[PDB]
Ligand binder design. Structure first.
Ligand SMILES: *[C@@H]1O[C@H](CO)[C@@H](O)[C@H](O)[C@H]1NC(C)=O
Ligand SMILES: COC(=O)COc1ccc(C#N)cc1
Length: 338
């Protein structure tokens, strides 16, 4: 179990003004820290956020959060369930800012909601240093779905923040799960992101922002555009046929749909050709790293926990780190989730 702590700085809030927070399980004999970002889409204007507040309030408020949560998958402390990092200090950061972890705007007389996702990550890092993070060797910022996109938007800022607080020895890395999307043609979204960044006062990594400049920062929400600009090491986990991608493509089998789906897999494979640390199975699914059975999927004979260990070795023969399926249809990999 991971135990809840609400932020001592009460000006860093969820959408409705209640304090943000984090769940923590310490491991006193470890110098490794894992901070995981939850996903769950976003909202981009008043009416759209009002509807989310009616039916998805735990994604907008901490008032009903439970005091504990069970760590699963990469957040499990059990070696059998988590061969990679079972002995690490575990942190789960709930998503309550509805801004893909990009916002930096307070609630005020002019703002019905607060969008502080980027400030929430930095405040969790600040408060954790006094709970042992100051003696860390590696900080892995991971996340799934919008939390995976949030890793791409925030990993370099976490490193810059510790670099100037006097901790140049902590190695910051990123693990982005199911957050790597294509801005392709629909079979039958970018505007919603463009409006959301304005509503949120959203921020994107500095070099990417300088490439695309004012009004075009929405480009930095797409992995193949922002990843080339990043300085920190980032491991990319991505189903070739992500359910969230098919949703924004209005896909719910004739020749037309067949060619559409095969072209989607081929294009995603191509965007990963120059990503040296990556795991991309040919499956139709959604998320992986916090699932209890994340140890079961394999690409070219190698599991994800093994690939991540090989990544660790490469940063310190038969230990690969670039694993991308080449077969062209969902479930051509026999280890896909059922
Ligand atoms: C609390 O957080 C806000 C938002 O990041 C920041 O402006 C302020 O300086 C913080 N105050 C303290 C005492 O940490
Ligand atoms: C969020 O969790 C999910 O359910 C699907 O993943 C997403 C959705 C939207 C965005 C953006 N911008 C990034 C990732």
């Amino acid at each position: 179990d991971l135990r809840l702590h609400l932020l001592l700085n009460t000006s860093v809030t969820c959408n409705d003004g209640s304090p943000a927070g984090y769940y923590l399980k310490e491991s006193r004999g470890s110098r490794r820290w894992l901070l995981f970002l939850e996903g769950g889409w976003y909202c981009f204007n008043r009416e759209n956020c009002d509807s989310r507040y009616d039916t998805m309030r735990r994604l907008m408020s901490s008032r009903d959060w439970p005091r504990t949560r069970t760590g699963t998958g990469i957040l499990s402390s059990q070696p059998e369930e988590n061969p990679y990092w079972w002995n690490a200090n575990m942190v789960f950061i709930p998503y309550c800012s509805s801004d893909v972890w990009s916002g930096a705007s307070s609630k005020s007389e002019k703002n019905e909601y607060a969008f502080m996702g980027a400030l929430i990550i930095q405040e969790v890092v600040r408060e954790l240093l006094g709970r042992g993070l100051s003696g860390a060797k590696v900080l892995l910022l991971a996340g799934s779905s919008a939390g995976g996109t949030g890793v791409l938007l925030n990993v370099d800022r976490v490193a810059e923040q510790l670099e100037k607080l006097g901790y140049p020895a902590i190695q910051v890395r990123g693990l982005a799960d199911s957050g790597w999307f294509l801005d392709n043609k629909q079979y039958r979204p970018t505007e919603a992101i463009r409006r959301g960044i304005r509503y949120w006062n959203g921020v994107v990594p500095e070099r990417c922002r300088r490439q695309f400049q004012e009004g075009e920062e929405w480009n930095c929400f797409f992995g193949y555009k922002v990843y080339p600009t990043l300085r920190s090491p980032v491991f990319v986990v991505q189903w070739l046929f992500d359910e969230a991608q098919l949703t924004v493509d209005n896909v719910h089998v004739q020749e037309g749909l067949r060619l559409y789906i095969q072209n989607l897999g081929r294009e995603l494979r191509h965007t990963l050709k120059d990503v040296p640390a990556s795991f991309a199975p040919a499956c139709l699914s959604h998320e992986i790293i916090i699932r209890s059975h994340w140890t079961d999927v394999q690409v070219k004979g190698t599991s994800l926990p093994r690939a991540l260990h090989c990544w660790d070795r490469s940063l310190h023969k038969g230990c690969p780190v670039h694993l991308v399926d080449s077969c062209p249809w969902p479930h051509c990999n026999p280890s896909c989730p059922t």
